[PDB]
Ligand SMILES: *[C@@H]1O[C@H](CO)[C@@H](O[C@@H]2O[C@H](CO)[C@@H](O[C@@H]3O[C@H](CO)[C@@H](O)[C@H](O)[C@@H]3O)[C@H](O)[C@H]2NC(C)=O)[C@H](O)[C@H]1NC(C)=O
Ligand SMILES: *[C@@H]1O[C@H](CO)[C@@H](O[C@@H]2O[C@H](CO)[C@@H](O[C@@H]3O[C@H](CO)[C@@H](O)[C@H](O)[C@@H]3O)[C@H](O)[C@H]2NC(C)=O)[C@H](O)[C@H]1NC(C)=O
């Protein structure tokens with residue numbers, strides 16, 4: 001069952017064995033992935049998060065981010081630790097009380113403390129549209145049509161060396177999959193369809209690192225949503241999905257009744273499908289209960305290319321149709337050396353006082369804010385352009401902006417910008433050496449918004465900056481509840497920190 005929009009959510013430690021290997025984890029709702037949180041567009045969500053964690057090897061503090069939800073007027077509820085809040089301590093709870101006006105689509109929730117979401121705190125978050133403009137394109141859209149893709153590690157996250165190339169031990173599809181080494185024939189996930197029906201498959205990358213080449217043998221996939229943004233219909237036979245991205249696609253159950261492999265090939269870790277790694281099963285009602293015998297093609301003839309995507313609505317692009325054609329045109333210098341990432345020469349290390357609390361306490365320019373050099377102010381009601389030229393080791397880096405979605409004016413592997421009709425999204429691969437992936441948005445959401453690589457090991461190694469959007473209006477725009485004001489005193493007391 002789905003939970004929400006008003007619900008408790010307990011965060012616990014437990015042993016799990018999603019690939020046959022037992023390890024302890026950090027779980028929401030007792031499962032991996034966590035339960036789907038759901039509601040309708042414009043609903044009030046009140047997710048009361050109970051921190052019941054006791055195992056220090058995965059951190060006993062926590063904080064949860066609602067990925068892709070704008071949090072307008074509720075920056076305090078966004079979740080990134082030491083940007084919008086201090087962590088919730090064990091034995092305490094906290095009500096994330098916000099609204100989702102003007103958004104409907106496929107989202108997710110995850111820990112936003114250190115690398116803790118890798119240890120298991122990740123689940124789907126769906127905002128349905130009762131008047132969805134795509135409703136007539138499918139028959140079925142429910143918890144059974146959500147498909148999660150996850151990396152899974154046998155080593156606990158707090159034992160992963162900072163700045164290292166960290167590699168997973170299994171791909172999990174809907175929480176199940178097989179280990180790349182010492183492979184055992186542990187259970188695979190089954191997605192069940194009825195011959196002749198059409199399904200809104202909500203594909204969610206809950207990855208901490210790898211991108212996946214996702215396909216379904218015998219089937220193609222008609223994309224209708226990208227990171228919450230409705231798209232024109234685009235039919236593909238393979239989707240390369242980067243960490244934290246989401247797609248809805250229509251699956252037409254139009255092949256013979258049977259069993260078909262579902263494939264998710266990561267860019268690192270185990271390559272291929274031997275022993276049923278990187279796999280799940282599409283089963284038609286009436287098929288024999290047995291593994292598929294289908295194969296993949298040698299090459300995919302209609303892969304997703306990001307410049308093929310276009311919004312369903314006439315979203316356009318803000319600003320002027322050339323590079324630098326914005327009120328505030330930025331170019332970030334994105335680098336890596338010696339185990340640490342940097343943006344504009346500064347490696348991100350979380351501050352002791354969350355950025356939002358520094359601003360509410362009166363710090364009002366970005367040079368007054370800590371960490372020094374990690375906070376860039378943005379002017380209000382202005383068109384922002386951010387060029388993100390690639391080259392830093394560990395690519396391709398999927399960059400994500402909190403508080404906003406953005407027009408993808410230039411995509412990976414294509415030097416031509418699009419000022420007319422590019423897709424809008426919230427997480428974008430910045431590509432490879434010599435690329436110049438560039439995003440645009442308008443500043444109508446006061447508050448400090450994190451910008452970072454969504455490979456969680458890279459964020460931990462410093463690949464982030466904070467956009468302090470409209471510092472002067474942050475306090476009036478974001479009134480804070482007493483429980484939020486109580487978080488830093490409690491956290492600092494529990495940890496013997498002075499502030
Ligand atoms: C990606 O696109 C951005 C624009 O969106 C390019 O930025 C431009 O970068 C050049 C230098 O690479 C800038 O010109 C230089 O400016 C300084 C003075 O500020 C001057 O001293 C140098 O002689 C040179 O003129 C230009 O200002 C800039 N545009 C913006 C908005 O900052 C960037 O080069 C592209 N990167 C790649 C790898 O293609
Ligand atoms: C590289 O990225 C560029 C920019 O996103 C892509 O260029 C765009 O290509 C599309 C598809 O061909 C062009 O749209 C077409 O326009 C014609 C004329 O209006 C129309 O009859 C077609 O039905 C379609 O709308 C679009 O104009 C063009 N934009 C620009 C700025 O060049 C390009 O396709 C990408 N390269 C690859 C290999 O995918």
Ligand SMILES: [Cu+2]
Pocket residue numbers: 065067110244400454
């Ligand atoms: Cu995220």
Ligand SMILES: [Cu+2]
Pocket residue numbers: 065066067068400401402403
């Ligand atoms: Cu986010």
Ligand SMILES: [Cu+2]
Pocket residue numbers: 394395396397398453454455458459463
């Ligand atoms: Cu990265």
Ligand code: NA
Pocket residue numbers: 316317318319
């Ligand atoms: Na425009």
